[PDB]
């Protein structure tokens, strides 16, 4: 139930929050909502045991 963000276009500002989960574009090819080889979900779940 806990998530964290990995990839962003820029850095953060102090005391700010990010809610939008858009597919990250790691290359020249646009994603357009498709998680391809160069496109990944920015939120990864905490695997806690």
């Amino acid at each position: 139930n806990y998530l964290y963000r990995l990839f962003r276009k820029s850095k953060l500002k102090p005391f700010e929050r990010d809610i939008s989960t858009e597919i990250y574009q790691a290359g020249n090819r646009p994603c357009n909502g498709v998680a391809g080889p160069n496109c990944y979900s920015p939120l990864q779940s905490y695997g806690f045991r």
């Binding site: 500002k13 102090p14 005391f15 700010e16 929050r17 990010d18 809610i19 939008s20 858009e22």
Partner: protein, 103 residues
């Protein structure tokens, strides 16, 4: 009013001053122009009556969104005048675009 924010996909909602008697409610939630019910009720900012110049030189410092307000009675005329601080709001968002609200 003022409709501050970046793009139209996340947050992007701001001030709602109406000048009747109340309802200057500042809202930072999801809304689509053309999941949150935030509010901030206070007094109207724009109180004045020989034209008047209401000047706002508001800023934000890492989310600390503050407004300096002054109404000065008189192209922009010369001479010097002060502007006084009003409030401090932790809006906590990143803003890159603006547009006025007219009605």
């Amino acid at each position: 009013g003022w409709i501050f924010g970046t793009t139209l996909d996340s947050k992007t909602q701001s001030l709602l001053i109406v000048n009747n008697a109340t309802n200057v409610v500042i809202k930072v939630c999801e809304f689509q122009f053309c999941n949150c019910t935030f509010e901030y009720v206070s007094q109207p900012f724009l109180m004045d009556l020989f034209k008047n110049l209401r000047e706002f030189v508001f800023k934000n410092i890492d989310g600390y969104f503050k407004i300096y307000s002054k109404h000065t009675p008189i192209d922009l005329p010369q001479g010097f005048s002060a502007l006084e601080p009003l409030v401090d709001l932790p809006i906590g968002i990143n803003i890159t675009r603006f547009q006025t609200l007219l009605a």
